[PDB]
Write a protein that binds this ligand. Structure first.
Ligand code: HEM
Length: 93
């Protein structure tokens, strides 16, 4: 997928709550590498890659994290998942 495209998807859809890779609503569940490994389903136990685990979360929602399946294309979701993985793993935030 395309992380650069994903930065645009993020700006349009995610930055209200996750500017800086943080979380304005639930402060512990950030988009940083340590928090993602602690909290994110699938990724947390090695059953999914970070990209796949983020795509699932984005598509389906959790708590006050909205579901974007049907609002964003599969491509956009894959791209934003690639973007988060890249930002987190590379400590770019
Ligand atoms: C498509 C844009 C978005 C993406 C890619 C995204 C991504 C994610 C990811 C990957 C997580 C898990 C973080 C972790 O486990 O440490 C998360 C959690 C969360 N996000 Fe988002 N997010 C988006 C939009 C939003 C928006 C707009 C809001 C605010 C209205 C929001 C609020 C939250 C909240 C509250 C959680 C924690 C949910 C919980 O487990 O209780 N997110 N998001």
């Amino acid at each position: 997928a395309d992380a650069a495209a994903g930065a645009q998807v993020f700006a349009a859809n995610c930055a209200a709550c996750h500017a800086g890779g943080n979380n304005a609503v639930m402060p512990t569940k950030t988009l940083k590498a340590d928090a993602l490994k602690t909290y994110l389903a699938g990724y947390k136990d090695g059953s999914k890659s970070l990209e796949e685990a983020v795509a699932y979360q984005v598509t389906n929602g959790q708590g006050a994290m909205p579901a974007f399946g049907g609002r964003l294309s599969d491509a956009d979701i894959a791209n934003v998942a690639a973007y988060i993985a890249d930002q987190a793993e590379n400590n770019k935030w």
